[PDB]
Amino acid sequence: MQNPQNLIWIALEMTGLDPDRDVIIEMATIVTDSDLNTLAEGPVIAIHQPEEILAGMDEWNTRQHGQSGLTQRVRESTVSMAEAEAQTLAFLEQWVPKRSSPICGNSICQDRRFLYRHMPRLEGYFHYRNLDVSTLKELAARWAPQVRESFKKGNTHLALDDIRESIAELRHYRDHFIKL
Amino acid sequence: MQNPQNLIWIALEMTGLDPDRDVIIEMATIVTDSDLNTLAEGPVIAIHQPEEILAGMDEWNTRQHGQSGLTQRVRESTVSMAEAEAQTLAFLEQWVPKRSSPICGNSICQDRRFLYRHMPRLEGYFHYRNLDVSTLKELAARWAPQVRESFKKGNTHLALDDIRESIAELRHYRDHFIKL
Numbered sequence: 001m002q003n004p005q006n007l008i009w010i011a012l013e014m015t016g017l018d019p020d021r022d023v024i025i026e027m028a029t030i031v032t033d034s035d036l037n038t039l040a041e042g043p044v045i046a047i048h049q050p051e052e053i054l055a056g057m058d059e060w061n062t063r064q065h066g067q068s069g070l071t072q073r074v075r076e077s078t079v080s081m082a083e084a085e086a087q088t089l090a091f092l093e094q095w096v097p098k099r100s101s102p103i104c105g106n107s108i109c110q111d112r113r114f115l116y117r118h119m120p121r122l123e124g125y126f127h128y129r130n131l132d133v134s135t136l137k138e139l140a141a142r143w144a145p146q147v148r149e150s151f152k153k154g155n156t157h158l159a160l161d162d163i164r165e166s167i168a169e170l171r172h173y174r175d176h177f178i179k180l
Numbered sequence: 181m182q183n184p185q186n187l188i189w190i191a192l193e194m195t196g197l198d199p200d201r202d203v204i205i206e207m208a209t210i211v212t213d214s215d216l217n218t219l220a221e222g223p224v225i226a227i228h229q230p231e232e233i234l235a236g237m238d239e240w241n242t243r244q245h246g247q248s249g250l251t252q253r254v255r256e257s258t259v260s261m262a263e264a265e266a267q268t269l270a271f272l273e274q275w276v277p278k279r280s281s282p283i284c285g286n287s288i289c290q291d292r293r294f295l296y297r298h299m300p301r302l303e304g305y306f307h308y309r310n311l312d313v314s315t316l317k318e319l320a321a322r323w324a325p326q327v328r329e330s331f332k333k334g335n336t337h338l339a340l341d342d343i344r345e346s347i348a349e350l351r352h353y354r355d356h357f358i359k360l
């Protein structure tokens with residue numbers, strides 16, 4: 001089912017936002033076609049982390065992941081960082097060829113930073129380009145403010161709705177901000 | 181002079197692709213207004229690096245920076261990374277207030293990472309938003325290919341020419357790819 005036009009959408013949770021101090025604890029992927037139609041949904045993987053890493057999280061993160069249950073899921077997981085990377089790679093490979101899709105989503109420079117340090121082979125499977133929806137949001141804010149203020153932010157507390165809300169944010173801009 | 185909706189455009193040259201292992205050897209900036217009108221061109225600075233750093237560059241960067249003149253300009257530079265940062269901030273300070281502008285250019289996630297590592301005072305001067313022209317390049321190649329070819333890009337290896345082309349690539353999308 002491969003197709004170099006298909007897009008790889010990704011969302012990550014981390015113990016914090018610094019790739020040197022922090023680690024990935026959840027990953028999720030969704031492959032669309034070039035026109036934002038879902039082809040398939042990757043695994044949502046909580047990635048095992050030892051207790052020292054888990055206790056080493058700052059205050060805001062310790063609360064947010066604990067109350068979400070991600071901490072407990074991460075504590076129980078038998079899937080390592082490398083194993084999750086391979087699981088996501090095994091899935092992405094039947095839909096998108098190597099170095100074809102950019103990373104798609106929101107705030108995905110930070111995602112590329114973490115993939116670079118912690119999953120270098122998955123980072124390498126993307127085209128080096130970034131499809132970041134917030135570029136369009138930033139342009140809409142300046143040049144067509146009504147299109148951005150008209151977007152209906154969804155719930156996104158779970159990883160696949162999070163990605164789907166980003167895909168729907170691109171749709172909104174394709175429909176109301178992009179002459180085609 | 182200052183105006184919080186002015187945009188800071190930046191292009192770097194590096195010794196390699198790792199923002200943490202490699203270094204910055206050239207930088208330039210251009211300030212436009214929020215409608216892509218060039219307000220001012222910042223200085224083009226070659227940054228001195230020890231000879232070992234230049235000899236250690238891979239094959240592509242040895243070729244490319246050798247034949248552009250940059251390798252020789254690096255060797256002959258007496259401007260350290262920090263002085264190039266202070267010189268660029270001195271210019272940008274006249275045109276954009278602190279934290280107002282995103283970082284604008286092509287694949288500027290790579291640029292921000294190098295700045296974050298090597299020029300964190302300059303990185304901190306940008307709004308946290310990334311204004312990535314190549315996000316639109318990928319959307320245009322997928323949703324309206326013949327506006328992606330309407331755009332004439334001279335293979336411009338002078339730093340300011342690379343930036344002016346980036347500003348012109350976004351102009352071409354505001355006109356032919358975006359509805360306002």
Ligand SMILES: Nc1nc2c(ncn2[C@@H]2O[C@H](COP(=O)(O)O)[C@@H](O)[C@H]2O)c(=O)[nH]1
Nearest residue numbers: 191192193194195196197238240241286287
């Ligand atoms: N190793 C390597 N680096 C590249 C390549 N293309 C661009 N770069 C890096 O990108 C920098 C310039 O960014 P650009 O303007 O090409 O986005 C160069 O200084 C170099 O470090 C490449 O094909 N191989």
